[PDB]
Design a protein around this ligand. Structure first.
Ligand SMILES: O=c1ccn([C@@H]2O[C@H](COP(=O)(O)OP(=O)(O)OP(=O)(O)O)[C@@H](O)[C@H]2O)c(=O)[nH]1
Ligand SMILES: O=c1ccn([C@@H]2O[C@H](COP(=O)(O)OP(=O)(O)OP(=O)(O)O)[C@@H](O)[C@H]2O)c(=O)[nH]1
Ligand SMILES: O=c1ccn([C@@H]2O[C@H](COP(=O)(O)OP(=O)(O)OP(=O)(O)O)[C@@H](O)[C@H]2O)c(=O)[nH]1
Ligand SMILES: O=c1ccn([C@@H]2O[C@H](COP(=O)(O)OP(=O)(O)O)[C@@H](O)[C@H]2O)c(=O)[nH]1
Ligand SMILES: O=c1ccn([C@@H]2O[C@H](COP(=O)(O)OP(=O)(O)O)[C@@H](O)[C@H]2O)c(=O)[nH]1
Ligand SMILES: O=c1ccn([C@@H]2O[C@H](COP(=O)(O)OP(=O)(O)O)[C@@H](O)[C@H]2O)c(=O)[nH]1
Ligand SMILES: O=c1ccn([C@@H]2O[C@H](COP(=O)(O)OP(=O)(O)O)[C@@H](O)[C@H]2O)c(=O)[nH]1
Lengths: 224, 220, 225, 229, 226, 224
């Protein structure tokens, strides 16, 4: 009734918590959350964002080149990746980082077949640096990664209960017809065209992933 | 000085607070342009302290912590690269950590070609090995590209003991032994001059390169 | 008066002639037609398609896993990259293939900075394998690649003279949405519209066209801002 | 009499069905037949051909450069690898593709010691891209790969009952490597066959499109043409 | 008018002379004459043998598993390759080594498009580890490597100048070698060259300046053509 | 009361017999001797040297290229021992510090232990994959890596004396004081600072490894 494997997307504020940089109090809670869901037998893969450092869109409006900016952003996601990797291991969770941009000793490259084979071994795969291409967003990276590793659903982890009065379950068509926010613009088209459910839920409420991954009606569940 | 390697701490990008201060980076890029226009070969080594120590205080593995700094120096390096091109300067970034899609790898021979070509080389990722500091990277890179001096660019500008009064200017390596331990011994053992100075005062970088009596000159 | 560097998108049509495999007569007049743009002094980069082999989306309708199908498709575009490379070298054109999927022994990996140098050196960069990610098309490749090497326009090389109303000489990105015209892919178009990349749809099998569009002549359909 | 581990050579035939491209009614039949051997405890390695896309030799006589054309042909074999991986996964079989042209993101490279380990683990190892070398053929990749992973026999999978005499004639049951040379028989390319003969590698030519043969062949039954020295 | 691009095959005995190991007196003489070739405007790529250490077949006959023995042999070739690279750089010659068995730190892998690009840039490519495949010999690697970089001929550098009868042959056909069965080339490697029209020139390189003489087009050694 | 796991260091002489190349009579006697330890339930890791190829002490070549030639030689000796060890019925796993994949798995000290705990013999070749390192330093390093109980400096002539004309136990402080040049400078300082016992013993005398592992009073045990 619930989800077997899932792809968790964590914006940059899930590691900064509204400020800039790393905020170990938030990162530690996130790992606690993911730590329990992994012990429950679920297969969790994580797409880290870079909002707490740079967003190439905000840097080109600043005058900077979009491409330099976009790459600065991705490297930021590789730092958050390592940070999440570190706390997860202090929780007793085996993690594996794979970066879109081939880095050397830092992390392993994007081997999508192996990434799925880590999940079947009960490991946490952390996809860093997004897709490694300027002019794309983390959200779109969560979709492509969720589609390719065969996750049962994408978990848009926000710091807010859901989609707004709140909603308990909508369609992909209704999100566009209603102009509803949350879930990226490009990412949502890629999910809808492929029948990838999106579950927007509050991650900072202690114990939501355990429940959301459990299948309980929480947050907003975009389907079909 | 023929070719110079400029060492910049991470705070030379974040100006006090965390993150980037585009006002600080713009001043640095503006002053580096004047040195390049003066006919000097400049290589820059970037620090990554402006993205956080707090990494050792919270208990991170030493390896992962150092790679977060090396990643940081790449972001500051790409940032400087952007403001240098608005200043009309041609630059090339070489990273010690092979990234390919983001910048070329570190090759000291190639790096020399660039400088001879009038373009600026920006050294990132420090040294692609944990357990090293940025001063050791700046010093170790300067020896490798044959630089004539290492420009330790501080927020001060050159003392006695202050940790109260009184500066200094020009001392011996043997009489010193600030400069970071492994970074200083690596210079002394190879006779590398080190010039500590304040770059955030408009026009000093142009002064130091010509050889004016500014800052502190550390010679053999 | 025209375009400095350009990004040409060649569907699998240009390689199989509408059928499976290679039509070595078609790729040739493509090569010959691309060399005239290069000798004219313009920098050109090409995004190779894989229609003449497999489309990852048409293989799942048939029963196969979508992901493997997509990789078969991206592998196909590499084979076309090599085909186009050969017919271009006999045109006296120095080419450089860059595959999204890292291969090393077959071609370079995608090094976009280095790719821009190749153009500046007068070479033809061939971006094979799409973007090396399943669930993305080559139309989206062409767009993303055009923006990253800073191309001036995406050349959608169709076998027809352009985009009609059932010949449009110039339309806007928003005008195509409100008219729901033929376009050149949904995602690829939104990526070009949102970033202000012009899209010129034109027939390159008609001798001289690519040279005329690159020189700035009013040919085909220009989609701007 | 039963073969412990086998190296099966699948030419482009078994993927295009004689025409260009992918004939899924053919691959599905092939996958169904391999799976029957796997479920019998046999260790199977597969060398995937590329006839259904390009042959470097046939493209050079067409004008293209032989080297550049060979990579086109090797890449094709990787496409067939991913195909056979799919239909073999629908039968329940666990597969592992190893390509001589290192393509990290699409499949692990050629690591023969590991590959033998998969076999030991009951997985099917699919070898794509032949040997990753212009001026070589998939037959030679069967020979070399059979020799290296320690396979007991090279199963040349055809669509004909076996190796005939005179090339239509009668069907031969068992011959020696030197006899194949003395009689003018085309068993599997000269470069590949020489590599087998020089190293005492048995060759068994048989029709696997006939439902059940590969199970009889591995079982040690007198099917097809067995070439031994 | 001679040969523009050449592929020079060096057996393990062009490194160890008498028996096993390295003899810097021989390897220097090889690097000396390779350098005259590069200085003369010719494009050279070298395929290194490893007989001076381990001979794949000769180890399995000893009791060892053949596959291991071929890698042991291939590894030796990488050793020789690193040794020649060094002497060729005391001579002022720029070299790049590519190993068929990927090793990263030791030398870039086999990238055949760079291997040609290096040649076009006037540097010498050293192919080591053979073809990284057991059950193959370096003589075969010389042929395959010569075909993929488009070399004009293979130069089999022997310690005795030419192909005899039991009488030095100055010109024979690929077909004539078999109809005669004439000692040197190697069965597999000879077929691969023959079938593709790859001329093989057996010659002695331990002689004043032969490789230079051969590359210039002079009639030295045994030339085997289509 | 013996040793659980042990790191046997083999000089190049243990494959060449004293001259260049491989002498299969000696390589067999070593493999036959290692078998006696494995059958005794002991966990053995071996570090191989490459002095029997670039024979002598002539390191014209740059030191960098020179070191890699040596390290390559070690891999070749590694494969040799692996082969004769399997003729003994001893399952082995070779790990090289220079990543080769096609030739042998890389060096993962965690992975290596598991090979030891599964009753397999791990052979560490290629020294430490870096120049400016010797085989002795590698042995000491690897013995610390995998938590060995002692390093077994296998000599061809047992005997640590006081004066060139026997000892039986000594101290790390005394070796430095008595002029004895056991093992190697860096390697010895790496062992003394980490309390790694060193046992210099004659490997070629049938039965010495088995009784030295068991804990008999044979050889010169350099204890902490
Ligand atoms: O570089 C690579 C390596 C491996 N892979 C692909 O990832 C998949 C799993 O790769 P793994 O190596 O991690 O799983 P395994 O089957 O080998 O399990 P163990 O024996 O080690 O316990 C394999 O199917 C392989 O084809 C790649 O795609 N690229
Ligand atoms: O890893 C690689 C790198 C390069 N190549 C292929 O080899 C050729 C590149 O060869 P090079 O990289 O060595 O030189 P270059 O052409 O790029 O010229 P400059 O940088 O000096 O300006 C190209 O044809 C490329 O496709 C590979 O196949 N694999
Ligand atoms: O990259 C590699 C990794 C491993 N190998 C070689 O493949 C062989 C086995 O390959 P495996 O690594 O997959 O099995 P294993 O020995 O580790 O045993 P288990 O964990 O499954 O219990 C090993 O002997 C290794 O040396 C390579 O050749 N290349
Ligand atoms: O495929 C990708 C993934 C990430 N990014 C960059 O990474 C930054 C951080 O990601 P994101 O903006 O999604 O952060 P989030 O909002 O999820 O915290 C973005 O601004 C982009 O510039 C990118 O360019 N392409
Ligand atoms: O970035 C890319 C580009 C292509 N493809 C695959 O390759 C096929 C061929 O691309 P395309 O659909 O553009 O074919 P075209 O119309 O260009 O011939 C697609 O169907 C996809 O399955 C892919 O997976 N990713
Ligand atoms: O080691 C190899 C294996 C294959 N090929 C190329 O791949 C094509 C497909 O292989 P093959 O001709 O054996 O196809 P088959 O007859 O097996 O279908 C060949 O024509 C060659 O051009 C190659 O170059 N090297
Ligand atoms: O592609 C190759 C080339 C060589 N070898 C091995 O490496 C040894 C050294 O090559 P060769 O015998 O040709 O050396 P030469 O005596 O010609 O120098 C061979 O005997 C084989 O065991 C191999 O396994 N594969």
């Amino acid at each position: 009734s619930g989800y077997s494997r899932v792809l968790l997307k964590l914006g940059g504020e899930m590691f900064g918590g509204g400020q800039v940089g790393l905020d170990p109090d938030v990162v530690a809670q996130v790992a606690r959350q993911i730590a329990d869901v992994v012990r429950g037998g679920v297969q969790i893969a994580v797409v880290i964002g870079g909002g707490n450092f740079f967003r190439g869109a905000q840097l080109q409006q600043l005058g900077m080149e979009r491409t330099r900016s976009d790459y600065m952003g991705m490297l930021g996601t590789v730092m958050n990746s390592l940070a999440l990797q570190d706390f997860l291991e202090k929780e007793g969770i085996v993690t594996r980082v794979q970066t879109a941009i081939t880095m050397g000793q830092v992390a392993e490259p994007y081997l999508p077949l192996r990434a799925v084979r880590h999940l079947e071994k009960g490991r946490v795969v952390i996809f860093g640096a997004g897709m490694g291409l300027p002019y794309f967003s983390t959200d779109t990276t969560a979709a492509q990664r969720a589609l390719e590793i065969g996750a049962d659903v994408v978990l848009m982890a926000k710091a807010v209960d859901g989609v707004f009065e709140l909603l308990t379950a909508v369609s992909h068509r209704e999100v566009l017809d209603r102009g509803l926010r949350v879930a990226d613009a490009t990412a949502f088209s890629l999910c809808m065209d492929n029948g990838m459910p999106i579950l927007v839920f509050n991650l900072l409420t202690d114990g939501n992933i355990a429940r959301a991954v459990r299948g309980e009606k929480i947050g907003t569940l975009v389907t079909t």
